Design a binder for this molecule. Structure first.
Ligand code: FAD
Ligand code: FAD
Ligand code: NAD
Ligand code: NAD
Lengths: 442, 442
């Protein structure tokens, strides 16, 4: 591989999305992906959920799962057979898509329209997408302790990290998870379900007051916390860790609080650092407020260079500048980039979204500026709230008395409406009136 | 309904620059400018100084000037005869450039690739440049007093504002200028030279401690202040104006400390608000840190939309994100945009610059990050190293012990060198050594 028309950087969700899009816009286009992950492109959400819930003892080899619709499919976006090899790519008639596993792009000659790989080799391109996502944070209290401790502490983002943990599930008494994040919460709840069978101890802790405390209003944060617990976790909020050593071949955690806890294995879901290493070498701007590559509303950075997924900080003409670490986003932005690389010139209009599930009694969808820092208004059946019990409802997020963000709590398929509301952006006088549009079944 | 290939918005310096550039890159291109000023495109720095120094009582009609090498020319970038009419433009063989005077562009349909004028009419375009510069600030203490006072208070940035003032020069005792910086000082010194003939009073005041105190180190700010004075101006630093009323048909100004001053006419040079009114309607981002339209290093905002001059906040790959209100910049950025509209894809590399002249004993050039807030090092003729008197030298501006900005104080033609230094951006160990590269002596 020496020169390719369409180069995508990163073997991830956004990259695939873009590639499918490009191919549809110019059939017989020639798209090369470049993944440092030696794994072919695959979706992540199952790792935190579906794979765990599976009734199959081959699950962790097949990596198939069963869908919300009921049907069964693989986490790979495609079987190896759809893709082609790099050697074949410039030659195979009517184009194709190559993925090139386990090579990192390490330098970006923007002006030369070219890149150097970690193996020294060089590819010149016509249009390029950066889709490098991010890489999870380590905790600095883990960074400080020695490899007698990091031997039994993992991070979670890839299949490797899953299989490893799924195994560790069937090998210890106690697994301790840190973070109020979706990942921390989503995982704890995966293990609470193993706890019901394997009788294993599961503990989530985090220095904040409740689960998802950063995206949900503090009341709902709590309610949720309870639901997690019941799912089967010992949830310890306000856990500002001190340090971690060993106590007879068993990890021990001290905290300013003064309490302390023994366990076997740790997982840290404490955010994600976007992968921006290519910026310096390319002469590309970073958004210092939000992190990640700075791009415009069309996801463009420079004449031939676009950015997408968790790596991309973009102007949302509607909601303003932001950056989004979520699946559906990475798909949208990917698809979008792909259009714009084929001359679409479309800005980010169709909004993206996300979901989470924490035991069967918490499943929600959401969209736009979802942030507990902002003033919210929750509306349920049977900083303001209307109609003890919050099992089903909808929550609004406001800037200047306009709905900038919506959460649909245990309400499903009503996304299209939420979209229309966010989009119209009226200054709704009566939110109770709006809430009826989401047939809450009050 | 009508349509032009290359549309430029604003009848200014940047717009012209771009148009000349475009025409050279695609001869027989068809470029339409759109000025809300009814005046054809013209350069401004003469109003500040060259036209006042002229030995002619027709000066203010011809608008010719005879500087700064000795040759004679007009402030219009060119004679009406080079440009063409709009009607002719789509038809005239081998293109041409039309200016369309006294129409404002008031709406921007980015997606539709079109604009509405204030007269309701509509132009669709293929590529567009925004070149709207800015509009000078009023003082809020003037805003509060009534049209008795505002009748005799101007702020000036256009020929209209010059002719008016040049007249007022030969009609009163006292003219009071307010503004610590460029235009403030540059005007005061125009009037000190009339003071030597017309025997008129001239007074500059401003709440800061010295002239140009924001771009020069505070010692040199002072030294400069003195030089102004001798030019013939009563300089009152720390003015801190309180309010303005009349005292027997003569304007009177009170100040926080307690002091007060009578005068006939006021001019306010207190900064410039960039013209961004098209952003909301177009869905274009504003840089809130620096002000103005946010663009990338290629001056591009969206697929077919570029920005330039004082309006444009851009990524300088070398020096970072910034925005610049200066002539040579507006020319560069204009030229550059024009290249990128014809597919150049060049980022902002060749640095831009500026100069100022405050009486014959202060004439300087400068480049890059010139800002007294930053640490500086001055080096003069025989931190600071003068081998009391600062008549000739060079001043360095530092971030992380790298030269990010340079001022050449009474040193001429040595710009190319300064460029090389800024550009190489070494961590120069001995600045005295660097200072020799500019032959301070002779
Ligand atoms: C366990 C889990 C559960 C999740 N659940 C949800 C959910 O329920 N809902 C939701 O909305 N979102 C969820 N997400 C988030 C979603 O998976 C991400 O937003 C998405 O994967 C990001 O895709 P991307 O293409 O931007 O980056 P990534 O998926 O990170 O792909 C980037 C790829 O590029 C590689 N790469 C990095 N640098 C280079 C380089 N220089 N050269 C070549 N390759 C490079 C990376 O190693 C990686 O292989 C979840 C994520 C995880 C991990
Ligand atoms: C008196 C004076 C002296 C100066 N001296 C110096 C100097 O000595 N050295 C130096 O480096 N710099 C100097 N400058 C700065 C320099 O002249 C300006 O920075 C430069 O002219 C800006 O060019 P521009 O093309 O960005 O905008 P402008 O020259 O402001 O041109 C834009 C114009 O286009 C029109 N316009 C605005 N909005 C719209 C719209 N919506 N639709 C249609 N038309 C519109 C308006 O007439 C507007 O003023 C001086 C400026 C002035 C005023
Ligand atoms: N959409 C989903 O349902 C879903 C599910 C799983 C993962 N993900 C994504 O995968 C990525 C990894 O997930 P994550 O859990 O890191 O998301 P997250 O970003 O919610 O992580 C938890 C949050 O805790 C904060 N934090 C920082 N330091 C901390 C500390 N020392 N202790 C406790 N909290 C700290 C971080 O701001 C972080 O945002 C994220 O981008 C997330 O968006 C999404
Ligand atoms: N290169 C040149 O020599 C030259 C000459 C003429 C004009 N210009 C450009 O045209 C514009 C006009 O010049 P200018 O002197 O007005 O700009 P300027 O910003 O240099 O001068 C005004 C300064 O006064 C201060 N100020 C702001 N608001 C104030 C207030 N309410 N009260 C008191 N002080 C206040 C600020 O420091 C501001 O920078 C500028 O953008 C300038 O860069 C440049």
């Amino acid at each position: 591989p020496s020169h390719v028309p369409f180069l995508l950087i990163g073997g991830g969700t956004a990259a695939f999305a873009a590639a499918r899009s490009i191919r549809a816009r110019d059939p017989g286009a020639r798209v090369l992906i470049v993944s440092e992950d030696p794994e072919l492109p695959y979706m992540r959400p199952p790792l935190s959920k579906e794979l765990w819930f599976s009734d199959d003892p081959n699950v962790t080899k097949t990596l198939q799962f069963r869908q919300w619709n009921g049907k069964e499919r693989s986490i790979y976006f495609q079987p190896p057979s759809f893709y082609v090899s790099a050697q074949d790519l410039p030659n195979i008639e009517n184009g194709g898509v190559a993925v090139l596993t386990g090579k990192k792009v390490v330098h970006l000659d923007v002006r030369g329209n070219m890149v150097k790989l970690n193996d020294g080799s060089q590819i010149t391109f016509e249009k390029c997408l950066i889709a490098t996502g991010g890489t999870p944070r380590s905790l600095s209290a883990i960074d400080r302790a020695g490899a007698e401790v990091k031997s039994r502490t993992t991070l979670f983002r890839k299949i490797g990290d899953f299989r490893a943990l799924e195994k560790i599930s069937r090998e210890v008494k106690s697994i301790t998870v840190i973070g109020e994040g979706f990942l921390g919460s989503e995982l704890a709840c995966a293990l609470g379900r193993k706890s019901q069978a394997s009788g294993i101890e599961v503990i989530q802790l985090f220095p904040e007051k409740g689960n998802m405390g950063k995206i949900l209003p503090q009341y709902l944060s709590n309610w949720t916390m309870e639901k997690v617990k019941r799912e089967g976790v010992k949830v310890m909020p306000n856990a500002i860790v001190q340090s971690v050593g060993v106590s007879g071949g068993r990890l021990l955690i001290k905290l300013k609080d003064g309490r302390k806890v023994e366990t076997d294995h740790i997982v840290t879901a404490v955010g994600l650092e976007p992968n921006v290493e290519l910026a310096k070498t390319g002469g590309l701007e970073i958004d210092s407020d939000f992190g990640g590559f700075r791009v415009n509303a069309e996801l463009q950075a420079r004449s031939n260079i676009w950015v997408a997924g968790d790596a991309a900080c973009f102007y949302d003409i509607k909601l303003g500048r932001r950056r989004v670490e979520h699946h559906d986003h990475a798909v949208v932005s990917g698809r979008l980039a792909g259009e714009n690389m084929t001359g679409a010139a479309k800005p980010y209009w169709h909004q993206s979204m996300f979901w989470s599930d924490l035991g069967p009694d918490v499943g929600y969808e959401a969209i736009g500026l979802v942030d507990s820092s902002l003033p919210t208004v929750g509306v349920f059946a049977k900083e303001i709230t209307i109609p003890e019990d919050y099992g089903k409802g909808v929550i609004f997020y406001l800037r200047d008395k306009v709905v900038v963000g919506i959460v649909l709590w245990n309400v499903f398929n009503r996304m299209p409406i939420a979209r229309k509301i966010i989009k119209d952006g009226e200054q709704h006088e009566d939110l109770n009136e709006v809430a009826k549009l989401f047939n809450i079944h009050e």
